[PDB]
Design a protein around this ligand. Sequence first.
Ligand SMILES: [Br-]
Ligand SMILES: [Br-]
Ligand SMILES: [Br-]
Ligand SMILES: [Br-]
Ligand SMILES: [Br-]
Ligand SMILES: [Br-]
Length: 123
Amino acid sequence: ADATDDYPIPNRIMRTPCTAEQIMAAARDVEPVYYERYMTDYKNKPPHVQQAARDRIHWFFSMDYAGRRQYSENTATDAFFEQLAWMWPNWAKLFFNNKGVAANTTDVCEQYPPDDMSVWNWD
Ligand SMILES: [Br-]
Ligand SMILES: [Br-]
Ligand SMILES: [Br-]
Ligand SMILES: [Br-]
Ligand SMILES: [Br-]
Ligand SMILES: [Br-]
């Protein structure tokens, strides 16, 4: 109905200066089960859904705290705000699912390369 500091989007994810690919590389090292779960889901999706999730997460991490917080608010007040969720509800599960994974990944994501797109290739 209303967003908290950590629901539906972790505070650390709304504040991180990292790219999606920095968070994903951090996850591959410090939250490997979460990374592999996400990539198993992702690889079962059609190419147009894969591309839509990459575009939308790049859009999210392009915003400052204000923009990210407004998106969190909009998805909390309306579970159907995000059109991508009509196709793939867990399109951002690696990024948004819980604050424990968020703390571990955002703690180290800055040390990884911002543009390493190989995090999107798995098997
Ligand atoms: Br929470
Ligand atoms: Br987009
Ligand atoms: Br913004
Ligand atoms: Br928005
Ligand atoms: Br799903
Ligand atoms: Br999620």
